[PDB]
Design an enzyme around this catalytic site. Sequence first.
Site, mmCIF file in Angstrom:
data_model
loop_
_atom_site.group_PDB
_atom_site.id
_atom_site.type_symbol
_atom_site.label_atom_id
_atom_site.label_comp_id
_atom_site.label_asym_id
_atom_site.label_seq_id
_atom_site.Cartn_x
_atom_site.Cartn_y
_atom_site.Cartn_z
ATOM 1 N N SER A 100 0.825 -1.181 0.000
ATOM 2 C CA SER A 100 0.000 0.000 0.000
ATOM 3 C C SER A 100 0.870 1.244 0.000
ATOM 4 O O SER A 100 1.721 1.451 0.871
ATOM 5 C CB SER A 100 -0.902 0.066 1.209
ATOM 6 O OG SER A 100 -1.571 1.313 1.184
ATOM 7 N N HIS A 102 0.168 4.046 0.892
ATOM 8 C CA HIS A 102 0.003 4.827 2.115
ATOM 9 C C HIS A 102 1.165 4.676 3.093
ATOM 10 O O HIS A 102 1.353 5.542 3.930
ATOM 11 C CB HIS A 102 -1.291 4.452 2.848
ATOM 12 C CG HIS A 102 -2.539 4.999 2.227
ATOM 13 N ND1 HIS A 102 -3.049 6.235 2.559
ATOM 14 C CD2 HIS A 102 -3.412 4.459 1.340
ATOM 15 C CE1 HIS A 102 -4.162 6.446 1.880
ATOM 16 N NE2 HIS A 102 -4.407 5.384 1.134
ATOM 17 N N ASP A 109 -5.641 10.529 1.079
ATOM 18 C CA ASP A 109 -7.002 10.500 0.573
ATOM 19 C C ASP A 109 -7.571 11.848 0.959
ATOM 20 O O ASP A 109 -7.368 12.322 2.078
ATOM 21 C CB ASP A 109 -7.788 9.399 1.228
ATOM 22 C CG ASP A 109 -7.234 8.063 0.900
ATOM 23 O OD1 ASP A 109 -7.018 7.790 -0.310
ATOM 24 O OD2 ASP A 109 -7.022 7.295 1.848
ATOM 25 N N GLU A 158 -9.772 6.168 -8.602
ATOM 26 C CA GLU A 158 -9.882 6.712 -7.250
ATOM 27 C C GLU A 158 -9.642 8.221 -7.277
ATOM 28 O O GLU A 158 -8.539 8.677 -6.999
ATOM 29 C CB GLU A 158 -8.886 6.037 -6.302
ATOM 30 C CG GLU A 158 -9.199 4.581 -5.957
ATOM 31 C CD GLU A 158 -8.306 4.017 -4.846
ATOM 32 O OE1 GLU A 158 -7.531 4.785 -4.217
ATOM 33 O OE2 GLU A 158 -8.386 2.799 -4.604
ATOM 34 N N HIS A 161 -7.748 9.961 -4.243
ATOM 35 C CA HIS A 161 -6.438 9.432 -3.805
ATOM 36 C C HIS A 161 -5.251 10.079 -4.483
ATOM 37 O O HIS A 161 -4.929 9.757 -5.635
ATOM 38 C CB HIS A 161 -6.440 7.914 -4.102
ATOM 39 C CG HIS A 161 -5.166 7.195 -3.770
ATOM 40 N ND1 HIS A 161 -5.081 6.285 -2.743
ATOM 41 C CD2 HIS A 161 -3.943 7.222 -4.343
ATOM 42 C CE1 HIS A 161 -3.852 5.798 -2.687
ATOM 43 N NE2 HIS A 161 -3.142 6.346 -3.649
#
Length: 185
Positions: A100, A102, A109, A158, A161
Amino acid sequence: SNAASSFASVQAVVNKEYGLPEDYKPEDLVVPNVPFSFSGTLEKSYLRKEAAEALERLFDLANKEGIQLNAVSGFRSYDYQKKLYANNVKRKGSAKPGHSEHQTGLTMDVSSKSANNELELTFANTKEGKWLKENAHRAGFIIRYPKGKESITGYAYEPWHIRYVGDIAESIYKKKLTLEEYMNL
Ligand SMILES: [Cl-]
Ligand SMILES: [Cl-]
Ligand SMILES: [Cl-]
Ligand SMILES: [Cl-]
């Protein structure tokens, strides 16, 4: 050849194929001074210093054009990603830990009230979503997972994102490329 190269670089590619060190946690995490959709200071309030400052700048740019954006979720550790993935898989009667973006501390996000601060497709039809799509690059960010690029990025669209990649975001936006393609990974 499943491990992401230059894992700590602002231009690192972390995806289904390329994973990060299980023990990688950026050492320059700070909270960007922007509004959040949630209260308090949690792990997801942080971004790497450089991406934090860029996000602040993107939000100032948005405000000048009356666009009010909220930060929803930033950094997520390997440990956290593991639990989230496991508990999400058994819900059958989300990225694998390490895979991920992140965890890089470069991703965030973002949403808006017009979309109930939710991370859903409808955010694309808002004036704020559309502004982000066309303006993210001005602060060093890209919409990491664009419309019909799932074949390459492995993820469906997305609009909420964003990923900080620095100055290359301008070229990535113009050329309509994915980070994968732009980095030849
Ligand atoms: Cl921390
Ligand atoms: Cl973009
Ligand atoms: Cl697209
Ligand atoms: Cl799509």
